[PDB]
Design an enzyme around this catalytic site. Structure first.
Site, PDB file in Angstrom:
ATOM      1  N   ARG A 227      40.743  39.281  41.429  1.00  0.00           N
ATOM      2  CA  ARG A 227      42.135  39.734  41.462  1.00  0.00           C
ATOM      3  C   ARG A 227      42.466  40.679  42.617  1.00  0.00           C
ATOM      4  O   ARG A 227      41.632  41.473  43.048  1.00  0.00           O
ATOM      5  CB  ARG A 227      42.556  40.358  40.124  1.00  0.00           C
ATOM      6  N   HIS A 228      43.697  40.578  43.106  1.00  0.00           N
ATOM      7  CA  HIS A 228      44.184  41.436  44.177  1.00  0.00           C
ATOM      8  C   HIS A 228      44.374  42.857  43.659  1.00  0.00           C
ATOM      9  O   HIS A 228      44.759  43.057  42.509  1.00  0.00           O
ATOM     10  CB  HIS A 228      45.511  40.896  44.706  1.00  0.00           C
ATOM     11  N   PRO A 229      44.096  43.855  44.508  1.00  0.00           N
ATOM     12  CA  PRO A 229      44.251  45.252  44.092  1.00  0.00           C
ATOM     13  C   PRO A 229      45.705  45.699  43.912  1.00  0.00           C
ATOM     14  O   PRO A 229      45.963  46.561  43.074  1.00  0.00           O
ATOM     15  CB  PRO A 229      43.600  46.033  45.239  1.00  0.00           C
ATOM     16  N   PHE A 234      47.856  37.631  40.853  1.00  0.00           N
ATOM     17  CA  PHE A 234      47.279  37.261  42.138  1.00  0.00           C
ATOM     18  C   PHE A 234      45.783  37.253  41.909  1.00  0.00           C
ATOM     19  O   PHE A 234      45.115  38.268  42.102  1.00  0.00           O
ATOM     20  CB  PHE A 234      47.652  38.312  43.180  1.00  0.00           C
TER      21      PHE A 234
END
EC number: 2.8.3.19
Lengths: 376, 375
Positions: A227-229, A234
């Site tokens: 996952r995107h930070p 996302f």
């Protein structure tokens, strides 16, 4: 045209992966590369799996188009030949442990005396300087010490190596970068320089978010998994059959996604209405998403999600990736010596990029003619 | 102060992939003028995390670059931008394909604005191919390239590598491609179009993953921390924290068995050769960890280094940047008060200072640059 390095002479003592990956690029773009291999089995990769027709695919992948001569620098006659090579050479490359070349009688200072225009390119685990310069430094070791292992994998899972020889490869591309930089610089200055690349330094420069977050928050490691930070949803998501990635980086896109998943109730839900809220509540959001996705095969979602204009893609294997029409369109799979292998990602207009290329050399294949060429 | 001193780079790149490439040029002496959209600027200015006003994401990969805001749809600016190109050596952009063209700047048009200009573009899939206009964030590229499938523990789900590998790959390839074109131009006296794909870049980093497939038709491979041809060559747990032991031959295996008091393994018919140790690596690992769990990692690093077997701790990024080696290589510099990664390309005779100029605020150089190039 055969490339911007056509007319350059590289004396290439590199072996294994890190050094030779770098020199392969010089060869790809025009330079004549003479592999100087030691007596014995030669370059270590000749003994690396996997094998095809008794010949190492490993050697072939990263040494196609390079000539081969076996020289023994402990022998004065061979040493004389090597020195004559250096006097004609633009680049001397090697990735031995630091100090090896000096003990054979070739310090950077001696090299300058032999040829003032010679670029000396070195690649090693930690570089030719520092307290760890003589330490063992396999790719796995560098990945471990750099922090990348601890940044990699699912957050609760144990730390894991990147699915490739990242440290070796980073060292390789920075080696090639440093060489070309030196070649450009030499053009005005008319003098060579010592390019000194460390695998450890190279890997540190690829840390991106892992380091940024630490510098600012003091937390380390991050361990975000897929996952995107800072954006959500996302991430990588499961379906009925196989996983896909959905990259939904703004409110407009989130609304579209919800439409396609028939989850329109979530758009103005107080948990998911903005991006920062979706990041905060990413876990529960993902639960909603995967409960809907589980009811259809990935191929169905790829159509439906793309239809509403949301970035989405399947997770492909290496096999599937190289068979994509895009790969062939970019000539990223070439045939060299009758072997299929990765192409050159550096595309420059006015420079040829053949699908069929000269294959890798057998051990000491060009040794007879090369010894003649540089004997005096 | 570096090989690229005297070069002018007009930099329209944004996010990570494009700016990583140009930051390298800036590091080694090129004047890099970052052309940002008015108001928002580079997307990374609004990327977290924030420190003393500035985005760390922006500052990490844009320190030392000058900043001008320009609207290429606005004629007054487009005119200034054009004067830049006629004096520039390199124009770099990482927009979606066609964007630079739709603004009136095809490679063709660029050629006749400045025949010596190097035009360099970085995108998800390049400017050619059926997927050229497809969405292509780093995560999408990793997924489609095969690298996710190769990454992680054998029986675990596929996982992204712990960084934006695709962007960074394309970044260094963008940089190396630009400098190749610059060397080429030094004889040709003509520019060229450097066209990099993050997808092509990532595929070139597949190594054993692709080799093994070409050889056996099996894909993916999923080996986790374990070397495919050497044993014990893996990551191992101790009493407190994991380490890696990289033991590639019989001589080293004998030495390692000495350090672990497992001498009985040396002549054991299961582990007498490297090939046998690879076959029986799982049970061998079980023997090793049963011993290792009795001491802390520091103890084992000492005992195993003493007998000359390659060994190393698994470190966090926090611990990596604090190693004395990092300081020795100047890999943690400070730019505008912020600690950040240094330049891995060390070239003798070229300056490599610990203190570098910080990131530029939006339009910070706008007034003086717009004057400089209005004509």
């Amino acid at each position: 045209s055969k490339g911007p390095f056509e007319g350059l002479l590289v004396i290439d003592m590199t072996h294994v992966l890190n050094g030779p990956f770098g020199t392969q690029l010089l060869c790809n773009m025009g330079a004549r590369v003479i592999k100087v291999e030691p007596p014995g089995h030669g370059d270590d990769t000749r003994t690396f799996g996997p094998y095809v027709d008794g010949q190492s695919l490993y050697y072939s992948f990263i040494n196609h188009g390079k000539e081969s001569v076996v020289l023994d620098l402990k022998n004065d006659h061979d040493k004389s030949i090597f020195i004559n090579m250096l006097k004609q050479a633009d680049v001397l490359a090697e990735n031995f442990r630091p100090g090896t070349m000096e003990k054979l009688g070739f310090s950077w200072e001696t090299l300058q005396e032999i040829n003032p225009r010679l670029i000396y390119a070195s690649s090693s685990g930690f570089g030719h300087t520092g307290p760890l310069k003589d330490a063992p430094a396999y790719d796995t070791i560098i990945q471990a010490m750099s922090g990348i292992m601890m940044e990699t994998g699912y957050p609760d899972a144990p730390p894991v190596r990147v699915g490739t020889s990242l440290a070796d490869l980073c060292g390789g591309v920075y080696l090639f970068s440093g060489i070309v930089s030196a070649l450009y610089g030499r053009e005005k200055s008319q003098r060579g320089a010592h390019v000194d690349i460390a695998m450890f330094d190279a890997t540190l420069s690829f840390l991106e978010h892992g380091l940024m977050a630490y510098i600012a928050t003091g937390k380390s490691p991050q361990r975000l998994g897929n996952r995107h930070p800072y954006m959500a949803p996302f991430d990588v998501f499961n379906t009925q059959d196989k996983p896909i990635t959905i990259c939904c980086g703004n409110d407009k896109l989130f609304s579209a996604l919800c439409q396609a998943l028939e989850l329109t109730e979530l758009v103005n839900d107080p948990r998911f209405s903005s991006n920062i809220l979706r990041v905060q509540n990413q876990a529960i959001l993902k639960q909603y998403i995967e409960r809907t996705l589980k009811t259809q095969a990935a191929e169905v979602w790829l159509a439906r999600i793309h239809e509403v204009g949301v970035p989405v893609a399947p997770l492909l294997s290496v096999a599937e990736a190289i068979k994509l029409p895009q790969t062939q369109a970019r000539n990223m799979l070439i045939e060299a010596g009758g072997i299929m292998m990765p192409g050159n990602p550096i595309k420059i207009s006015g420079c040829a990029d053949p699908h069929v290329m000269p294959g890798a050399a057998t051990l000491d294949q060009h040794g007879e003619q090369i010894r003649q060429e540089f004997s005096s």
